[PDB]
């Protein structure tokens, strides 16, 4: 199945490209996420002359990924929660940290864009990647306390 990549993909390629992926991956993962489009002749036709626009909005992702990158690199977020001497009685997630930047710091990031492979259960400082734009990894210091 052919699809028009709406983004640069590490295992697929880049926006504007039409690759062949099995129906499960794009059809359940990519299309609903808007990561790409089906390869219909209509979308092939409109494909031309939009890749300029598509890379335009993509470049917007680069720009706000930059002014937001430099803005959020130099700050540590603290998480006021209820935890033990060696254990967090609750848990933190991506949307949690987004809530912390929003209600506590006011900055607005995307929770899903944030990387969280394990909701934290221990205290202390943490450094994590965000990556708003492809090939744009952003570490970040979040502090969890009681």
């Amino acid at each position: 199945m052919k699809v028009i990549l709406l983004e640069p993909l590490e295992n697929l390629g880049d926006v504007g490209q039409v690759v062949d992926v099995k129906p499960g991956y794009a059809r359940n993962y990519l299309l609903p996420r808007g990561l790409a489009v089906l390869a219909t002749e209509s979308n092939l036709k409109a494909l031309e002359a939009r890749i300029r626009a598509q890379a335009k909005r993509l470049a917007e992702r680069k720009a706000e990924a930059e002014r937001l990158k430099e803005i959020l690199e130099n700050l540590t977020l603290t998480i006021p929660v209820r935890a033990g001497e060696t254990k967090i009685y609750g848990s933190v997630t991506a949307k949690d940290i987004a809530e912390a930047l929003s209600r506590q710091h006011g900055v607005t990031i995307d929770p899903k864009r944030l990387a969280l492979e394990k909701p934290i259960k221990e205290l202390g400082e943490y450094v994590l990647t965000y990556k708003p734009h492809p090939e744009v990894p952003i570490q970040l210091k979040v502090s969890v306390v009681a």
Partner: protein
């Protein structure tokens, strides 16, 4: 398992034909049938949940017609479906057929 919501493939009535012996083509004396009994072949229906107009719509569609529904989804983009409920939305997408 009922019809395919798009193709309308209903279950069919087929025969279980239990045979025996070697086929004539293989030098066998001939496939002696040991017994026939009715059965029903069912469509391989599946659930197809799709986000149209902020709504989730489920389609018990044949697997062979899975992508077809997505066509309708894209074909729905020339439509004004909000803020209709999933009943009217589904009836409209069927109207696209």
């Amino acid at each position: 398992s009922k019809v395919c919501e798009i193709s309308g493939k209903r279950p069919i009535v087929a025969n279980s034909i239990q045979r025996r012996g070697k086929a004539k083509r293989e030098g066998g004396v001939g496939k002696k049938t040991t017994g026939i009994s009715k059965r029903r072949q069912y469509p391989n229906l599946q659930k197809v949940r799709v986000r149209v107009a902020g709504q989730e719509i489920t389609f018990r569609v044949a697997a062979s017609h899975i992508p077809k529904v997505y066509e309708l989804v894209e074909r729905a983009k020339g439509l004004k479906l909000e803020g209709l409920s999933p009943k009217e939305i589904k009836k409209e997408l069927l109207k696209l057929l």
